[PDB]
């Protein structure tokens, strides 16, 4: 973040979508929730129909309980690409945000079926399975999550 502040010009910083994504993910990692949202909104302003890595935003907006923006983003993402796994995991995150979670598990497993090498879908599945007061399924899901991404 200090390197952004010093070694990155402001005009490049507030214009590059990739720098915005990296900066938002970084501020997520420091658990700076307010900072990340007002730049991810700028990212959506730059291009609404971009998927890349929307898992971070889905995780953020689940915490902030913004049901309407999440609904809009999920609708737009599906209308753009149905086969990208991040879109399906965002939908499952919204569904878990609402209330029902069995269909969220099913959506997550389908998203993992679209691309077996997506570790964040596995780890989101495992984190969700804790809410199902079930541990063995959660434990197996966590193990298969860590299998996909060694450093997670």
């Amino acid at each position: 973040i200090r390197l952004f502040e010093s070694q990155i010009p402001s005009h490049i910083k507030d214009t590059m979508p990739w720098c915005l994504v990296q900066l938002g993910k970084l501020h997520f990692e420091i658990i700076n929730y307010d900072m990340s949202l007002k730049y991810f909104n700028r990212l959506k302003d730059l291009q609404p129909a971009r998927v890349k890595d929307m898992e971070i935003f889905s995780t953020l907006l689940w915490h902030l309980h913004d049901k309407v923006k999440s609904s809009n983003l999920a609708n737009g993402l599906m209308d753009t690409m149905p086969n990208k796994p991040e879109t399906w995991c965002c939908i499952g995150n919204l569904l878990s945000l609402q209330k029902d979670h069995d269909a969220a598990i099913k959506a997550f497993e389908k998203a993992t079926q679209l691309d077996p090498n997506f570790a964040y879908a596995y780890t989101l599945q495992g984190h969700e399975h804790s809410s199902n007061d079930s541990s063995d399924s959660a434990k197996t899901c966590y193990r298969k999550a860590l299998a996909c991404d060694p450093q997670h």
Binding site: T59, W62, L124, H127
Partner: peptide
């Protein structure tokens, strides 16, 4: 056991039943 119901009923429902015994996050 529910041997009889009110006003000479036939069957019986059971709305609730419970048993009692003694003894922030990252997504």
């Amino acid at each position: 056991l529910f041997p009889v119901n009110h006003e000479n009923g036939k069957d019986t429902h059971l709305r609730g039943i419970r048993l009692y015994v003694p003894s922030a996050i990252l997504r």
